[PDB]
């Protein structure tokens, strides 16, 4: 019973700077705490979903920019999308293995390969950006008289 009721509803919070500052401090603690500590295999799934959601937003956005671009660049973009999907597959596979091997000699190795897959995903995202940028600049070259 380290449990207490939510704060009173009898007070307007809309300019309550104490409330806001307590919120800021509790969040700063949560953020420090979760960074210091290694997250349990439970938590892996929600984190990976967040990354998958972010990827899908990106792929959907990249789908809508491809029409605009010179057809000579489409294969490169699509390949770079391919590579992100490839990194997501790997990430999910290593996450599943890390959970599977949770209390074995393989726990930390699988965790590591999961992080390397995630890192690869971020690196490949920035490469997609650069591929799209070169495309757009090429397109501007073409567009200008």
Swiss-Prot record:
The modification Phosphoserine is found at residue 4. Changing residue 22 to G: Loss of interaction with TGFB1I1. Phosphorylated on tyrosine residues upon activation, e.g. upon integrin signaling. Sumoylated; this enhances autophosphorylation. Coiled coil: none annotated. Residues 6-145 are annotated as: Interaction with ARHGEF28. The modification Phosphothreonine is found at residue 8. Detected in B and T-lymphocytes. Isoform 1 and isoform 6 are detected in lung fibroblasts (at protein level). Ubiquitous. Expressed in epithelial cells (at protein level). It comes from the Eukaryota. It is found in: Cell junction, Focal adhesion; Cell membrane; Cytoplasm, Perinuclear region; Cytoplasm, Cell cortex. The modification Phosphotyrosine is found at residue 19. Interacts (via first Pro-rich region) with CAS family members (via SH3 domain), including BCAR1, BCAR3, and CASS4. Interacts with NEDD9 (via SH3 domain). Interacts with GIT1. Interacts with SORBS1. Interacts with ARHGEF28. Interacts with SHB. Part of a complex composed of THSD1, PTK2/FAK1, TLN1 and VCL. Interacts with PXN and TLN1. Interacts with STAT1. Interacts with DCC. Interacts with WASL. Interacts with ARHGEF7. Interacts with GRB2 and GRB7. Component of a complex that contains at least FER, CTTN and PTK2/FAK1. Interacts with BMX. Interacts with TGFB1I1. Interacts with STEAP4. It is linked to Aberrant PTK2/FAK1 expression may play a role in cancer cell proliferation, migration and invasion, in tumor formation and metastasis. PTK2/FAK1 overexpression is seen in many types of cancer. Non-receptor protein-tyrosine kinase that plays an essential role in regulating cell migration, adhesion, spreading, reorganization of the actin cytoskeleton, formation and disassembly of focal adhesions and cell protrusions, cell cycle progression, cell proliferation and apoptosis. Required for early embryonic development and placenta development. Required for embryonic angiogenesis, normal cardiomyocyte migration and proliferation, and normal heart development. Belongs to the protein kinase superfamily. Tyr protein kinase family. FAK subfamily. The Pro-rich regions interact with the SH3 domain of CAS family members, such as BCAR1 and NEDD9, and with the GTPase activating protein ARHGAP26. The C-terminal region is the site of focal adhesion targeting (FAT) sequence which mediates the localization of FAK1 to focal adhesions. This is Focal adhesion kinase 1. It comes from Homo sapiens (Human). The chain holds residues 907 to 1051 of 1052 of the full protein.
